[PDB]
Ligand binder design. Structure first.
Ligand SMILES: CCCc1oc(CCC(=O)O)c(C(=O)O)c1C
Ligand SMILES: CCCc1oc(CCC(=O)O)c(C(=O)O)c1C
Length: 569
């Protein structure tokens, strides 16, 4: 029995949680009650299996069972069988489910609901997160849940909870979104590009983090990590969590052979141990390391070694280059590796290979400078404009690049891209590139998966599917879509009401940014000069109307003077 297997390994508490997440992720629209129902029914069945490992259908695979249990509450998907049936669900996951925004009751109600029923208050948290983020890294969701519990458990018995809980909950919402985004990139890499693409990413990333580890060690770590994510991304949450535990054990047992910063991590609870290991900083770089040119460009055996085991050889190149460049972003290292490979492919087919591939490092110089100049520029701009204005600048840029993309996606993607400014610019040159460019890769992947749902721009498609590692350079190279036909104004789109006054300070900027997008789509060829001079107007329209006697009509009146002056510029 497979269910029995995993149950013992995970226990009843984790087993129940993971199954709840699996269900909320497949059928995101179904109510909490129903999932809870199916979870218990499934959990009890598991209990009978532990005992009689041949009872009902304890012989079956998790998918069969899980699928049949969901099919008692959903249709075409359920008509199919085994493989096809499961693939069906995976394809129907919704990255942008039409779910009501989630509002949180006053501190008092929460603590009551938490204290009264603790298991229920937590199961609902997992449910509400899993259904909105169909790809959240399961094992990590269990880690946030405990952290969530610790928040209430501590803050509800204090002097002023509002002050103690609200903050800690915000820190959790944000970090939970970042995590969700990082994991969405991992699944997309695996699902749209193949495991080879993910392995390459892992080697480079783990080699930067574990500089002292041996190639054969990193390779072992990479092979295992790949399996973990291959399972979590395919919906095999139980085995994923299981496998992820093993990997954490291994790493801790063999610390000395991997990194010296793993100590603090291995001295804590499972869930906290895994999370800690995944986020540990880079170990110090080994002292006396030879020059890369030695074994990779000067040696005359290059082509022979490349021919013998193209995969191991390139893998070794990446590890060697990555380990000594924690200052480079993972995508840049992958671009370098791609450049080196392309060179051996053509060069090793020449008369004198050596001569041909002798200057490959001169091919790197341009690739290393592009990212550095981009970062240097944009951080200088960020420092001058501040976050809000920087996001506006990016908003104008991206809309002009890909005007067809829906206004909600553009606004979300641009705001996020703009956060790269606060998140990375404060770091010194040395750590800026990994921070900025790898973060940009997560954000642009967001754009790509949201866009794939309803394609409207061949330019977004091409840049999203051509190369995983070149996405950022592809997007940056775009300027203005010259074939784009300007949109025609819509009264409703630019009519500001008094309801924007109740909305939070941020919910306002968001509205103004939404208006800026619509503007740009209407006047692509407009300049940043006019745009600014118009934005400041909208600001005025809010302050007036919002504080001017009983006026819900000012919105139509003040809005009239607005559009009038807006149609003029
Ligand atoms: C095996 C090395 C430690 C490690 O690293 C990662 C990826 C973190 C990242 O993406 O940078 C994980 C994980 O995904 O669970 C673990 C465990
Ligand atoms: C901090 C980096 C974020 C960033 O900055 C730019 C402006 C580049 C330029 O000045 O051309 C882009 C982009 O064009 O896509 C991105 C992404």
């Amino acid at each position: 029995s497979e269910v029995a297997h995993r149950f013992k390994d995970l226990g009843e508490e984790n087993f129940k949680a993971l199954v709840l997440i699996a269900f909320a992720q497949y059928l995101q629209q179904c109510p909490f009650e129903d999932h809870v129902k199916l979870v218990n029914e499934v959990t009890e069945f598991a209990k009978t299996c532990v005992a009689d490992e041949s009872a009902e259908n304890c012989d079956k695979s998790l998918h069969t069972l899980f699928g049949d249990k969901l099919c008692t509450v959903a249709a075409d998907c359920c008509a199919k069988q085994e493989p096809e049936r499961n693939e069906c669900f995976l394809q129907h996951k919704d990255d942008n489910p039409n779910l009501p925004r989630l509002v949180r009751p006053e501190v008092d109600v929460m603590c009551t609901a938490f204290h009264d029923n603790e298991e229920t208050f937590l199961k609902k948290y997992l449910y509400e997160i899993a259904r909105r983020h169909p790809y959240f890294y399961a094992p990590e969701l269990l880690f946030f849940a405990k952290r969530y519990k610790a928040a209430f458990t501590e803050c509800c018995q204090a002097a002023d909870k509002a002050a103690c809980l609200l903050p800690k909950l915000d820190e959790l919402r944000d970090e939970g979104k970042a995590s969700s985004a990082k994991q969405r990139l991992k699944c997309a890499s695996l699902q749209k590009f193949g495991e080879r693409a993910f392995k390459a990413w892992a080697v480079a990333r783990l080699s930067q983090r574990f500089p002292k580890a041996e190639f054969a060690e990193v390779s072992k770590l990479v092979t295992d990590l790949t399996k973990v994510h291959t399972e979590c991304c395919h919906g095999d949450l139980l085995e994923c969590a299981d496998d992820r535990a093993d990997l954490a054990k291994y790493i801790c047992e063999n610390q000395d052979s991997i990194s010296s910063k793993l100590k603090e991590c291995c001295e804590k609870p499972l869930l906290e141990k895994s999370h800690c290991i995944a986020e540990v900083e880079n170990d110090e770089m080994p002292a006396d390391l030879p020059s890369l040119a030695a074994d990779f460009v000067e040696s005359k055996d290059v082509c022979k070694n490349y021919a013998e085991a193209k995969d191991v050889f390139l893998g070794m190149f990446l590890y060697e280059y990555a380990r000594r460049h924690p200052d480079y972003s993972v995508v840049l290292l992958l671009r370098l590796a791609k450049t080196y490979e392309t060179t051996l492919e053509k060069c090793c087919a020449a008369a004198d290979p050596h001569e041909c591939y002798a200057k490959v490092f001169d091919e790197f110089k341009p690739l290393v400078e592009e990212p550095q100049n981009l970062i240097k520029q944009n951080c200088e701009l960020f420092e001058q404009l501040g976050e809000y204005k920087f996001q506006n600048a990016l908003l104008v840029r991206y809309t002009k690049k890909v005007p067809q993309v829906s206004t909600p996606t553009l606004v979300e993607v641009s705001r996020n891209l703009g956060k790269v400014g606060s998140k990375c610019c404060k770091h010194p040159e040395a750590k800026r590139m990994p921070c900025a460019e790898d973060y940009l890769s997560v954000v642009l992947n967001q754009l790509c998966v949201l866009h794939e749902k309803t394609p409207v721009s061949d330019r977004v498609t091409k840049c999203c599917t051509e190369s995983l590692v070149n996405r950022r350079p592809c997007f940056s190279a775009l300027e203005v879509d010259e074939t784009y036909v300007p949109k025609e104004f819509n009264a409703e789109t630019f009519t500001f009401h008094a309801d924007i006054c109740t909305l939070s300070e941020k919910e306002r900027q968001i509205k103004k940014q939404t208006a800026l997008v619509e503007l740009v789509k209407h006047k692509p060829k407009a300049t940043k000069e006019q745009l600014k001079a118009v934005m400041d107007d909208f600001a005025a329209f809010v302050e007036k109307c919002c504080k001017a006697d009983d006026k819900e009509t000012c919105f139509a009146e003040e809005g009239k003077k607005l559009v009038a002056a807006s149609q003029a510029a």
